[PDB]
Design a protein around this motif. Structure first.
Motif, PDB file in Angstrom:
ATOM      1  N   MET A   1      31.441  -1.853  -3.498  1.00  0.00           N
ATOM      2  CA  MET A   1      31.384  -3.316  -3.668  1.00  0.00           C
ATOM      3  C   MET A   1      30.135  -3.582  -4.493  1.00  0.00           C
ATOM      4  O   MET A   1      29.033  -3.473  -3.964  1.00  0.00           O
ATOM      5  N   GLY A   2      30.312  -3.710  -5.807  1.00  0.00           N
ATOM      6  CA  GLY A   2      29.358  -3.092  -6.710  1.00  0.00           C
ATOM      7  C   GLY A   2      29.478  -1.566  -6.597  1.00  0.00           C
ATOM      8  O   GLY A   2      30.264  -1.071  -5.775  1.00  0.00           O
ATOM      9  N   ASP A   3      28.701  -0.849  -7.411  1.00  0.00           N
ATOM     10  CA  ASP A   3      28.705   0.605  -7.580  1.00  0.00           C
ATOM     11  C   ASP A   3      30.042   1.120  -8.142  1.00  0.00           C
ATOM     12  O   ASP A   3      31.063   0.437  -8.094  1.00  0.00           O
ATOM     13  N   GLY A   4      30.032   2.321  -8.719  1.00  0.00           N
ATOM     14  CA  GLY A   4      31.185   2.936  -9.354  1.00  0.00           C
ATOM     15  C   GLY A   4      30.735   4.058 -10.284  1.00  0.00           C
ATOM     16  O   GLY A   4      29.543   4.338 -10.397  1.00  0.00           O
ATOM     17  N   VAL A   5      31.693   4.713 -10.952  1.00  0.00           N
ATOM     18  CA  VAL A   5      31.409   5.710 -11.973  1.00  0.00           C
ATOM     19  C   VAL A   5      32.435   5.582 -13.097  1.00  0.00           C
ATOM     20  O   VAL A   5      33.513   5.028 -12.882  1.00  0.00           O
ATOM     21  N   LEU A   6      32.125   6.132 -14.273  1.00  0.00           N
ATOM     22  CA  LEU A   6      33.076   6.305 -15.360  1.00  0.00           C
ATOM     23  C   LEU A   6      32.745   7.609 -16.078  1.00  0.00           C
ATOM     24  O   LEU A   6      31.569   7.926 -16.257  1.00  0.00           O
ATOM     25  N   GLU A   7      33.783   8.333 -16.507  1.00  0.00           N
ATOM     26  CA  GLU A   7      33.670   9.442 -17.436  1.00  0.00           C
ATOM     27  C   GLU A   7      34.077   8.980 -18.833  1.00  0.00           C
ATOM     28  O   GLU A   7      35.139   8.359 -18.983  1.00  0.00           O
ATOM     29  N   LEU A   8      33.263   9.321 -19.834  1.00  0.00           N
ATOM     30  CA  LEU A   8      33.594   9.223 -21.246  1.00  0.00           C
ATOM     31  C   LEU A   8      33.197  10.551 -21.911  1.00  0.00           C
ATOM     32  O   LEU A   8      32.455  11.341 -21.323  1.00  0.00           O
ATOM     33  N   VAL A   9      33.725  10.833 -23.101  1.00  0.00           N
ATOM     34  CA  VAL A   9      33.507  12.052 -23.873  1.00  0.00           C
ATOM     35  C   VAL A   9      32.834  11.642 -25.175  1.00  0.00           C
ATOM     36  O   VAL A   9      33.268  10.666 -25.779  1.00  0.00           O
ATOM     37  N   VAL A  10      31.767  12.345 -25.571  1.00  0.00           N
ATOM     38  CA  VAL A  10      30.876  11.940 -26.657  1.00  0.00           C
ATOM     39  C   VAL A  10      30.752  13.046 -27.700  1.00  0.00           C
ATOM     40  O   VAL A  10      29.956  13.974 -27.560  1.00  0.00           O
ATOM     41  N   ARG A  11      31.497  12.921 -28.794  1.00  0.00           N
ATOM     42  CA  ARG A  11      31.317  13.813 -29.930  1.00  0.00           C
ATOM     43  C   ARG A  11      29.958  13.498 -30.567  1.00  0.00           C
ATOM     44  O   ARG A  11      29.486  12.363 -30.466  1.00  0.00           O
ATOM     45  N   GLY A  12      29.328  14.505 -31.183  1.00  0.00           N
ATOM     46  CA  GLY A  12      28.052  14.370 -31.883  1.00  0.00           C
ATOM     47  C   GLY A  12      26.865  14.971 -31.122  1.00  0.00           C
ATOM     48  O   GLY A  12      25.753  15.007 -31.649  1.00  0.00           O
ATOM     49  N   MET A  13      27.065  15.451 -29.888  1.00  0.00           N
ATOM     50  CA  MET A  13      25.983  15.975 -29.059  1.00  0.00           C
ATOM     51  C   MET A  13      25.500  17.355 -29.525  1.00  0.00           C
ATOM     52  O   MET A  13      25.688  18.360 -28.843  1.00  0.00           O
ATOM     53  N   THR A  14      24.850  17.402 -30.687  1.00  0.00           N
ATOM     54  CA  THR A  14      24.297  18.631 -31.229  1.00  0.00           C
ATOM     55  C   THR A  14      23.151  19.176 -30.356  1.00  0.00           C
ATOM     56  O   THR A  14      22.182  18.477 -30.066  1.00  0.00           O
ATOM     57  N   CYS A  15      23.283  20.447 -29.960  1.00  0.00           N
ATOM     58  CA  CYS A  15      22.211  21.355 -29.560  1.00  0.00           C
ATOM     59  C   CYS A  15      21.276  20.794 -28.486  1.00  0.00           C
ATOM     60  O   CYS A  15      20.181  20.309 -28.780  1.00  0.00           O
ATOM     61  N   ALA A  16      21.707  20.901 -27.223  1.00  0.00           N
ATOM     62  CA  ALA A  16      20.961  20.458 -26.053  1.00  0.00           C
ATOM     63  C   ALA A  16      20.488  19.017 -26.242  1.00  0.00           C
ATOM     64  O   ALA A  16      21.305  18.117 -26.102  1.00  0.00           O
ATOM     65  N   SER A  17      19.209  18.822 -26.581  1.00  0.00           N
ATOM     66  CA  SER A  17      18.518  17.597 -26.973  1.00  0.00           C
ATOM     67  C   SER A  17      19.307  16.296 -26.783  1.00  0.00           C
ATOM     68  O   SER A  17      18.992  15.509 -25.892  1.00  0.00           O
ATOM     69  N   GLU A  68      30.272   9.550 -30.228  1.00  0.00           N
ATOM     70  CA  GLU A  68      31.595   8.939 -30.133  1.00  0.00           C
ATOM     71  C   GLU A  68      32.102   8.835 -28.695  1.00  0.00           C
ATOM     72  O   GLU A  68      32.844   9.727 -28.292  1.00  0.00           O
ATOM     73  N   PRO A  69      31.762   7.781 -27.930  1.00  0.00           N
ATOM     74  CA  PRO A  69      32.224   7.619 -26.558  1.00  0.00           C
ATOM     75  C   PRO A  69      33.723   7.315 -26.487  1.00  0.00           C
ATOM     76  O   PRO A  69      34.130   6.191 -26.195  1.00  0.00           O
ATOM     77  N   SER A  70      34.543   8.342 -26.700  1.00  0.00           N
ATOM     78  CA  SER A  70      35.960   8.305 -26.385  1.00  0.00           C
ATOM     79  C   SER A  70      36.122   8.219 -24.868  1.00  0.00           C
ATOM     80  O   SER A  70      35.366   8.841 -24.124  1.00  0.00           O
ATOM     81  N   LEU A  71      37.112   7.474 -24.388  1.00  0.00           N
ATOM     82  CA  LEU A  71      37.458   7.461 -22.979  1.00  0.00           C
ATOM     83  C   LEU A  71      38.264   8.721 -22.645  1.00  0.00           C
ATOM     84  O   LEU A  71      38.880   9.343 -23.505  1.00  0.00           O
ATOM     85  N   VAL A  72      38.193   9.132 -21.376  1.00  0.00           N
ATOM     86  CA  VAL A  72      38.862  10.331 -20.870  1.00  0.00           C
ATOM     87  C   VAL A  72      40.291   9.997 -20.433  1.00  0.00           C
ATOM     88  O   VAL A  72      41.227  10.736 -20.720  1.00  0.00           O
ATOM     89  N   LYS A  73      40.439   8.906 -19.677  1.00  0.00           N
ATOM     90  CA  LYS A  73      41.681   8.533 -19.020  1.00  0.00           C
ATOM     91  C   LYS A  73      42.769   8.231 -20.056  1.00  0.00           C
ATOM     92  O   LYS A  73      43.899   8.696 -19.938  1.00  0.00           O
ATOM     93  N   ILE A  74      42.405   7.415 -21.044  1.00  0.00           N
ATOM     94  CA  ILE A  74      43.193   7.006 -22.195  1.00  0.00           C
ATOM     95  C   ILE A  74      42.185   6.818 -23.332  1.00  0.00           C
ATOM     96  O   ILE A  74      41.003   7.082 -23.115  1.00  0.00           O
ATOM     97  N   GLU A  75      42.632   6.320 -24.484  1.00  0.00           N
ATOM     98  CA  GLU A  75      41.817   5.673 -25.497  1.00  0.00           C
ATOM     99  C   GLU A  75      42.516   4.328 -25.711  1.00  0.00           C
ATOM    100  O   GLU A  75      41.846   3.379 -26.170  1.00  0.00           O
TER     101      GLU A  75
END
Length: 75
Positions: A1-17, A68-75
């Motif tokens: 009631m409040g609180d939650g989570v979301l997964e997204l996928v992010v292209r461009g995450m070069t080399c740890a950092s 690139e925050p693509s969604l996981v569930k759908i786009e």
């Protein structure tokens, strides 16, 4: 009631950092509990409150941070 989570996928995450570049920056947002920007999975999960800050802020922050925050569930 409040609180939650979301997964997204992010292209461009070069080399740890990029990981912490996301994570550390996102942890500023006054409605996030916990992030996990995993590189191998190319995945950012965010445990933020969807009622206040909401997904959109995050997604556009992530976008603007240069990924690139693509969604996981759908786009």
């Amino acid at each position: 009631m409040g609180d939650g989570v979301l997964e997204l996928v992010v292209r461009g995450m070069t080399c740890a950092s990029c990981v912490h570049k996301i994570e550390s920056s996102l942890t500023k947002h006054r409605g996030i509990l916990y992030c996990s920007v995993a590189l191998a999975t190319n995945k950012a999960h965010i445990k933020y409150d969807p009622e206040i800050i909401g997904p959109r802020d995050i997604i556009h922050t992530i976008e603007s941070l240069g990924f690139e925050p693509s969604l996981v569930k759908i786009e």
